[PDB]
Every structure is written in structure tokens, then in C-alpha cells.
Amino acid sequence: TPTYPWRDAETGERLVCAQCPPGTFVQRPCRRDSPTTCGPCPPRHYTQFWNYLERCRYCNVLCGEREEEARACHATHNRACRCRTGFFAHAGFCLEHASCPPGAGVIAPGTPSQNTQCQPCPPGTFSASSSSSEQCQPHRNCTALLALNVPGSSSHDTLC
Amino acid sequence: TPTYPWRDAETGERLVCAQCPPGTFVQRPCRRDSPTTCGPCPPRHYTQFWNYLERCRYCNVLCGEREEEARACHATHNRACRCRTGFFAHAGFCLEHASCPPGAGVIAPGTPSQNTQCQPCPPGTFSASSSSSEQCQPHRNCTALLALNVPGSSSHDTLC
Amino acid sequence: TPTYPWRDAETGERLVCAQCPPGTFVQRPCRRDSPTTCGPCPPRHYTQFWNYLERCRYCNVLCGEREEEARACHATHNRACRCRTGFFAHAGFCLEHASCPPGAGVIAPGTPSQNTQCQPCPPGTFSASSSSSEQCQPHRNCTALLALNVPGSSSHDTLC
Amino acid sequence: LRKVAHLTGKSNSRSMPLEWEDTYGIVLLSGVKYKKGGLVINETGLYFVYSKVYFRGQSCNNLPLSHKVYMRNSKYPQDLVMMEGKMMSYCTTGQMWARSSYLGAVFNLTSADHLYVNVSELSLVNFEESQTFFGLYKL
Amino acid sequence: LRKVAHLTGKSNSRSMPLEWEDTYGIVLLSGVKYKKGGLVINETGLYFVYSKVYFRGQSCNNLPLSHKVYMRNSKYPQDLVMMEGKMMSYCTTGQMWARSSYLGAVFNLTSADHLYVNVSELSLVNFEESQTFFGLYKL
Amino acid sequence: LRKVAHLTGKSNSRSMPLEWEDTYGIVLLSGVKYKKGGLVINETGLYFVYSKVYFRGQSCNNLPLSHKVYMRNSKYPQDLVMMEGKMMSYCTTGQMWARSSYLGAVFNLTSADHLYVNVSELSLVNFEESQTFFGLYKL
Numbered sequence: 011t012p013t014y015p016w017r018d019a020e021t022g023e024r025l026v027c028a029q030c031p032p033g034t035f036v037q038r039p040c041r042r043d044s045p046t047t048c049g050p051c052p053p054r055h056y057t058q059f060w061n062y063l064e065r066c067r068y069c070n071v072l073c074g075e076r077e078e079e080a081r082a083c084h085a086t087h088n089r090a091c092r093c094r095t096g097f098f099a100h101a102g103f104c105l106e107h108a109s110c111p112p113g114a115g116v117i118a119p120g121t122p123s124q125n126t127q128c129q130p131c132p133p134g135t136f137s138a139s140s141s142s143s144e145q146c147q148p149h150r151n152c153t154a155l156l157a158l159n160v161p162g163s164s165s166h167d168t169l170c
Numbered sequence: 171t172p173t174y175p176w177r178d179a180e181t182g183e184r185l186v187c188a189q190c191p192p193g194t195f196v197q198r199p200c201r202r203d204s205p206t207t208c209g210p211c212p213p214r215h216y217t218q219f220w221n222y223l224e225r226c227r228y229c230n231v232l233c234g235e236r237e238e239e240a241r242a243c244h245a246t247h248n249r250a251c252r253c254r255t256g257f258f259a260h261a262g263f264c265l266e267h268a269s270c271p272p273g274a275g276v277i278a279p280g281t282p283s284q285n286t287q288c289q290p291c292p293p294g295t296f297s298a299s300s301s302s303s304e305q306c307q308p309h310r311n312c313t314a315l316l317a318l319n320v321p322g323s324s325s326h327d328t329l330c
Numbered sequence: 331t332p333t334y335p336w337r338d339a340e341t342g343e344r345l346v347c348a349q350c351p352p353g354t355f356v357q358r359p360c361r362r363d364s365p366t367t368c369g370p371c372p373p374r375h376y377t378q379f380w381n382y383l384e385r386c387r388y389c390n391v392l393c394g395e396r397e398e399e400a401r402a403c404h405a406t407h408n409r410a411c412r413c414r415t416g417f418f419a420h421a422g423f424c425l426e427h428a429s430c431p432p433g434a435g436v437i438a439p440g441t442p443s444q445n446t447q448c449q450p451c452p453p454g455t456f457s458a459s460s461s462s463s464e465q466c467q468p469h470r471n472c473t474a475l476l477a478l479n480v481p482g483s484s485s486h487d488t489l490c
Numbered sequence: 491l492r493k494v495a496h497l498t499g500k501s502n503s504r505s506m507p508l509e510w511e512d513t514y515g516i517v518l519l520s521g522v523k524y525k526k527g528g529l530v531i532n533e534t535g536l537y538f539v540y541s542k543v544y545f546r547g548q549s550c551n552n553l554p555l556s557h558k559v560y561m562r563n564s565k566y567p568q569d570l571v572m573m574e575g576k577m578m579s580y581c582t583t584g585q586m587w588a589r590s591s592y593l594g595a596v597f598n599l600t601s602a603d604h605l606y607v608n609v610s611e612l613s614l615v616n617f618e619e620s621q622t623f624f625g626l627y628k629l
Numbered sequence: 630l631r632k633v634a635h636l637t638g639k640s641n642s643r644s645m646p647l648e649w650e651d652t653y654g655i656v657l658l659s660g661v662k663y664k665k666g667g668l669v670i671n672e673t674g675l676y677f678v679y680s681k682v683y684f685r686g687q688s689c690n691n692l693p694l695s696h697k698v699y700m701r702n703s704k705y706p707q708d709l710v711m712m713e714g715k716m717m718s719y720c721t722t723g724q725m726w727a728r729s730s731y732l733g734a735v736f737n738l739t740s741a742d743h744l745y746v747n748v749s750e751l752s753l754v755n756f757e758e759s760q761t762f763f764g765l766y767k768l
Numbered sequence: 769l770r771k772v773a774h775l776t777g778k779s780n781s782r783s784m785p786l787e788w789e790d791t792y793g794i795v796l797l798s799g800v801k802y803k804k805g806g807l808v809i810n811e812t813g814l815y816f817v818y819s820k821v822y823f824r825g826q827s828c829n830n831l832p833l834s835h836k837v838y839m840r841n842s843k844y845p846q847d848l849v850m851m852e853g854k855m856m857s858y859c860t861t862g863q864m865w866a867r868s869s870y871l872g873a874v875f876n877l878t879s880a881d882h883l884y885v886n887v888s889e890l891s892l893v894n895f896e897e898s899q900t901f902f903g904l905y906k907l
């Protein structure tokens with residue numbers, strides 16, 4: 011149990027007081043005859059660590075319009091936010107996940123921490139869409155069933 | 171005649187006082203035995219509305235170098251400005267009226283509130299100048315008198 | 331010797347006091363029976379002119395990382411800086427001296443106050459380097475000794 | 491006890507003038523009232539008044555930003571601007587951007603004066619308590 | 630009675646340092662004098678000093694803008710800069726632009742000190758009373 | 769005697785938080801202590817706190833600049849930000865640039881609170897005494 015130094019305001023005597031646990035604050039310091047008295051965080055406030063604060067801290071993190079609550083305000087911690095689905099965090103902002111243009115496909119979708127990753131479609135695959143989900147797909151094997159009218163590109167399927 | 175609530179400073183009694191008209195201010199509030207006394211705006215100051223001010227407002231609008239007085243400072247109103255001839259108002263600035271380049275002619279000149287409007291010269295008309303006034307004019311009818319050496323463009327007259 | 335007006339704090343009497351010389355300050359004003367008493371600037375401080383200051387000024391000019399001391403802090407003057415070798419002064423910054431690209435040669439090197447000056451190499455001369463020192467040099471006279479394989483340019487010597 | 495106010499940004503603001511947080515966090519309000527976006531003076535005298543607003547956006551289009559502190563009372567039916575700043579051509583088109591505007595000075599204010607802050611572009615404002623605020627004190 | 634000044638921009642300024650309006654509008658001047666662009670201190674002590682200047686222009690060319698508050702008295706023949714800000718690369722070339730510079734801090738000043746404000750580009754300054762100003766107060 | 773501080777930029781700063789000059793030049797420190805970048809409050813009460821930092825660079829790359837004033841004491845093992853400004857997209861890529869950040873407001877502070885200033889990019893800071901500073905006074 012952690013402690014803190016405190017001079018009695020009545021006497022000036024040098025005391026060792028016990029600190030209050032997360033979710034509480036110091037309501038009355040210890041004195042010669044009694045220990046520290048902790049009280050409970052009131053609504054909207056918090057203490058996350060052992061402390062000797064004389065009031066709780068306000069939950070001053072609020073979630074903007076492109077964010078959602080990753081953790082709630084609670085007597086033992088502030089609120090925390092992340093980017094809502096579709097967005098990722100960059101230099102304090104919540105940015106829209108990129109789309110991979112035609113000719114390129116998704117090799118990793120966007121997360122709350124990363125943007126969409128794209129590759130140029132490799133030989134024998136295509137992507138015809140600007141899309142933040144669509145992956146490069148193999149061309150149809152025309153010959154495997156007609157014969158080819160036009161060979162596929164990285165952006166268009168093979169035509170029969 | 172509009173009124174205002176006022177507690178006597180001598181008694182604290184609750185009175186209904188008459189307000190002062192544009193061009194005046196409250197010089198002495200009303201009391202039980204006399205009405206409000208208004209005085210006249212001193213130079214450079216004004217009151218535009220019925221009021222119970224205890225001094226007039228300063229004419230704090232001043233005309234920059236590309237502006238001119240649209241209305242003067244007067245006991246009953248502040249000064250007001252507009253852009254001098256040749257300029258128009260945009261996002262707080264006074265901008266020079268545009269010129270329509272060769273190939274284009276003026277369909278509305280600049281005003282204090284609008285920029286010059288241009289059209290590309292329509293068939294059979296030209297404008298050879300960069301000009302904030304010149305309109306598209308019809309080509310000369312060469313044949314109507316020589317024969318044409320070069321047909322006109324939107325930027326050059328027909329040559330004979 | 332310059333002077334200054336001073337009222338005795340003891341009497342209020344109007345006195346003419348002598349000022350203190352560069353490298354000193356006023357330690358005690360003059361009074362009816364004695365002259366001004368000057369003391370010596372303490373370390374890191376200075377007075378550059380005759381004065382009647384009651385303390386010296388701090389040497390508040392400091393030399394950034396692309397600068398060097400052109401004059402030291404001294405009881406009779408503040409420090410002064412200039413750009414270190416390789417840099418020149420521009421709008422408060424110390425900028426790197428430019429390099430003249432291939433095809434161009436140095437006609438004046440950089441100083442602390444000026445950038446490198448370049449000319450395009452004149453006929454019969456070349457510079458093959460991006461260099462803040464290299465000047466345009468004449469082409470070799472191949473014929474003056476082989477015959478020319480390729481005539482020189484402004485960026486390449488004549489080949490034999 | 492010193493007349494004083496320091497209020498912090500309120501996310502709720504749907505309209506002009508801005509509203510402010512007067513109870514939670516790192517705020518003060520003593521001998522001065524808060525009513526509908528407004529600080530209400532109750533003792534005539536000299537006050538230093540200040541405000542900061544923090545603007546930011548994903549994609550700059552250089553919309554003019556304006557920030558004003560203004561006064562209103564019942565004696566005249568029109569506001570008086572006490573201080574104001576405007577920003578134009580403050581970012582590079584299309585980039586993420588951020589900038590604040592700071593205003594502070596001394597004014598003689600009268601009992602029953604109401605002070606407010608206004609801004610051009612409510613949607614570019616960020617309301618974090620340490621970034622956007624409005625306050626005063628009696629000298 | 631509190632020593633105090635709040636002065637507003639004067640359009641007239643033809644030269645450096647700037648001149649200020651000391652009589653009309655939303656200004657204050659009490660136990661401190663105004664003389665030729667200068668606020669003259671008459672009681673030695675601690676003062677908070679502040680100034681804002683509002684710069685703007687039709688067509689940005691990123692001319693460096695500088696704003697300084699400085700002190701002069703008879704005891705030394707050279708000025709002392711108390712605070713200063715400089716702006717460079719503040720707008721996009723060719724656009725309409727606007728930006729302010731704000732300065733405020735505490736200083737120990739002496740009787741007969743004269744304080745002034747200076748700026749790099751007089752022609753880019755806008756002098757509206759709520760936009761450009763210079764003031765102080767004794768703590 | 770008035771509790772007051774005005775400190776100026778210290779070039780030495782190798783780390784965060786910044787260090788400040790407390791003895792030489794146009795500085796003040798009375799009834800408030802300076803310890804390792806920090807102003808130490810010794811009398812509980814209301815203080816106005818302010819800071820300016822001057823940023824500049826040869827060649828803009830729009831690195832985000834952040835400036836914060838924060839408080840720390842022994843009662844909780846985590847800092848509290850009192851005021852902060854951030855700049856992004858503030859210059860034209862590749863140009864010489866300069867800009868300052870100004871912060872000032874009122875706070876209730878307690879005995880043994882330590883106040884500090886932090887910045888994102890130590891290498892872009894310029895430390896001239898009139899350009900970069902940190903101060904406070906007891907109301």
C-alpha cells in the first residue's frame with residue numbers, strides 16, 4: 011500500500027498517510043489517531059492510480075463525430091476513443107480508409123490504426139473497381155471452357 | 171415610445187423610464203418627479219436606435235484606401251463604406267475588376283458588389299482587347315462593301 | 331563628457347550629473363558634494379555607450395548552430411554573430427551556399443553575406459560538376475597536341 | 491473573493507454564439523455568471539478578457555476563419571465587438587491542418603454586460619478543454 | 630485608480646513606430662501617458678503588456694512580417710525589445726490573406742520608460758479597433 | 769511582494785520539457801521557484817499563466833508543431849495539460865518559415881504544483897529572449 015507524507019494542519023506533526031486506490035480520492039487526510047479516508051469518485055470523474063488527490067479528475071476525453079468509445083468513462087479510468095469503422099487514426103485525425111483504384115487490389119484492409127494497403131494486380135489477376143475491400147481476382151480461363159476474344163489486363167477481366 | 175426599467179439610485183424605487191431617440195443618449199435617468207433627459211450625440215459618435223446608453227457610440231468604421239464613404243458619420247448612424255469605382259467587395263477586400271481577355275467580351279461590367287462578367291465571343295463577333303469594358307462587336311461585313319482576305323476569329327476582326 | 335539631469339532623492343535639488351562610460355554603469359548618482367560613481371560591468375553584461383543606466387545590459391545575442399562569434403561578449407559590447415564558413419545570411423537564417431550545376435561555373439564564391447554566383451559556361455569552357463567552388467575551365471586543345479573525337483560542351487570536356 | 495471565469499469548449503454547440511462548459515474540468519466561475527453562451531458581469535469595472543479557439547480540418551479549403559469576442563446589453567439593440575481575429579490563406583489546399591486564434595486585452599465593463607464568443611465555421615472548431623477556452627478576471 | 634491603457638490602431642500611421650488612438654472608441658488611458666506612438670510609464674513597477682496586430686493583403690507574396698514591442702528611455706541611447714514575433718511562409722502565393730500576431734507578458738518597468746510597437750510592413754496592417762491594439766496594466 | 773515569473777528561452781535544452789533562463793536578461797522570478805524546466809508554486813491561489821514559443825526552419829516540411837503548458841505534482845502520477853496549441857499545414861513546402869504559438873489563461877493552482885512547457889520539435893525552436901518565454905503571476 012503506497013503512502014505519502016503529510017503535516018497535521020492541527021499540530022504540524024510529520025505523518026505517513028496511506029494513499030487512496032483507483033476509483034477514490036482523499037476526502038480527509040490521516041491524523042495521529044486515524045488513517046486516510048478515501049471517498050468514491052463522483053459521476054464523470056476518475057482516478058486511475060493510487061493517489062492523494064483531494065478531488066477526482068474529470069473525464070475530459072470526448073469522442074468526436076468520426077470516433078467511438080473504446081472505453082467508457084468510469085471511476086477507475088478516463089474515456090478513450092478510437093476511429094469508427096471505415097476510418098483510421100493519423101496525426102490526431104480520423105481519416106477515411108483509402109480505395110484501391112482499378113488495376114490495384116486490397117492486400118490488407120483498413121483498421122483503426124492503419125490505412126488500406128494496395129498492390130498492383132499481379133499477372134493473371136485483375137481488379138476493375140475503386141474499392142477499399144475488393145481484392146485482385148484471377149482472370150477467367152476462357153480456354154478452360156470459348157477461346158479468348160481479349161486477354162485480361164490488371165484492370166479488366168479476360169473477354170470471351 | 172419605448173421604455174426601460176430603472177431603480178432610483180436615491181430611493182431604490184422601481185421606475186419606468188422613457189428611452190432616448192436615435193441621435194441622443196441618456197444624460198440623466200428619470201426619477202419620480204422628472205422624465206429621462208436625453209442629450210445630443212457629440213461629434214464623431216452616434217446612436218442609431220432608441221437606447222438607454224449613457225454615452226454615444228464612436229463612429230468606428232473607417233474607409234481604407236480602396237474604399238469611399240457610402241454614408242457619413244452622423245449623430246444617427248455610423249459611417250459606411252463601399253469600394254471606389256473600379257473595385258468590388260469580396261471577403262472583406264476591395265478587389266480590382268477583372269479584364270476580359272482577347273477572345274472574350276464583357277456581358278456585365280463590374281459594380282461595387284460584383285466582378286466583371288465575360289463571355290467567349292459568339293460567332294461573327296470579336297474582342298481584340300484585355301478590357302474590363304469592351305464588349306464583343308460584330309465582324310465587319312467585307313463582302314457587304316472588298317472580298318475577305320481572312321475570316322474573323324473571336325479575337326480578330328475580319329481582314330479585307 | 332556627457333551629462334544628465336538628476337533630482338537629489340535626499341533634497342529634490344536639481345543637479346547635473348556626469349554619465350558613465352562604455353563598460354560601466356551608474357552605481358551611485360551624483361549629489362551636491364560628489365560626482366556620479368560608475369561601476370564596472372559584471373560578467374555577461376555590457377554597456378556600449380555613455381549611459382546613466384543603473385545596471386548593465388545582458389549579452390543576449392547567442393550564436394545558433396550555423397553561426398560563429400564575430401565578436402565576443404565584452405563589457406563594452408554585446409556579442410555578434412555571423413554565419414560559419416559554407417553559409418550565408420538571408421532573412422535571419424544561415425543558408426548553405428549553392429552549388430553551380432554541370433554546365434555552369436562559379437564566378438564568385440559564397441561569403442557570409444552573399445550566395446555563390448554562377449554563370450553558364452562560355453564557349454570553349456566547361457564545368458562537369460555540381461560544385462560551390464569549381465570554375466569554368468577551358469576545353470583541352472586536342473588538335474594542339476590527337477584530333478578531336480567529340481567537341482566539348484559547356485558540361486563536358488573535349489574528348490580525344 | 492476575486493471575480494473570475496475560465497470556461498472550456500463545449501462540443502454541443504449547434505449554434506452561435508458558442509456555449510461553454512462552466513462546471514467540469516479545469517474551469518472557474520466566481521462572481522460572474524454563465525448564461526446561454528454568455529459571461530454576465532455583475533460588478534462594473536476593469537477586466538482582462540481572453541479567448542482561444544482551436545480550429546482544424548482533414549482537408550484544407552481555406553474557408554475564412556473568424557473569431558470574435560463581443561458584448562451585448564439591454565441599453566442598445568446591437569452588439570459591440572471588443573476583439574477579433576480573422577485567418578485567410580492559412581493552409582495548403584487539401585492537407586490536414588490546424589491553427590488557433592488567441593485574443594486578450596483589458597476592457598471597462600458594466601454590470602449586466604453579457605460577453606460572448608462567435609466563430610465563422612463552427613464545424614472546424616475543436617473543443618478540447620486545453621485548446622479552446624474563454625475567460626476573464628477583474629483587475 | 631488603476632494604471633491602465635488600451636489603445637487601438639491608428640490608420641494615419643505614416644511611419645514607425647505605429648501611432649495609436651487614445652481618445653475615441655473602446656480605449657482606456659489612466660495614469661499612463663500617450664506621446665507620439667508611445668506609452669509613457671509614470672510609476673515604476675510590474676506591468677502586463679500586450680499587443681495585437683492584424684495583417685492582411687489581396688495577393689500574398691510572403692513578405693516577412695515582424696511585430697515588436699520595445700522600450701526606450703533617456704538612460705541609454707538604444708532600444709530594448711521586450712517581445713517580438715515574426716511570420717514567414719504564412720500564405721499561399723497570390724491569394725487573399727490575413728493573420729494576426731499576439732504578444733503579452735509581464736515586465737518590470739521604470740518611471741519615464743516609453744513603450745512602442747513596431748512592424749515590418751506598415752502597408753499590410755489593418756487598423757480596426759477590435760483587430761489591432763496595444764495596452765498594459767499595472768499589476 | 770508579488771508572486772511573479774517571466775523566464776526566457778534557454779538554448780541548452782537537449783530534452784523535454786524545455787528549460788528556461790531564470791537569472792539573466794529581461795526575466796523575473798519572485799515568490800515562485802524554478803527547478804529543472806519547472807515553475808514551482810508555493811502559495812495556493814489564482815494565477816494567470818502564459819507562454820510563447822517561436823518556431824522557425826530553413827525548409828518547411830510541415831512537421832506538426834505542438835506547444836503545451838502542463839502541471840505535475842506528487843498527488844497523482846500523471847500530468848495535467850492546462851493549455852495547448854497545435855499547428856499543421858502552416859507553411860509552403862520547401863520555404864524558409866517562422867511562426868509563434870501564444871498561450872495564456874487563468875488557473876487555480878496549489879502549493880507544490882510544478883508547471884512546465886513541452887513542444888513537439890525541439891529543433892525548430894528559437895530561443896531568443898523576446899521570442900520565446902514562459903511566465904505567470906498571482907492575481
Ligand SMILES: [Mg+2]
Nearest residue numbers: 110111114139
Ligand atoms: Mg481496385
Ligand SMILES: [Mg+2]
Nearest residue numbers: 270271274299
Ligand atoms: Mg476582351
Ligand SMILES: [Mg+2]
Nearest residue numbers: 430431434459
Ligand atoms: Mg558547375
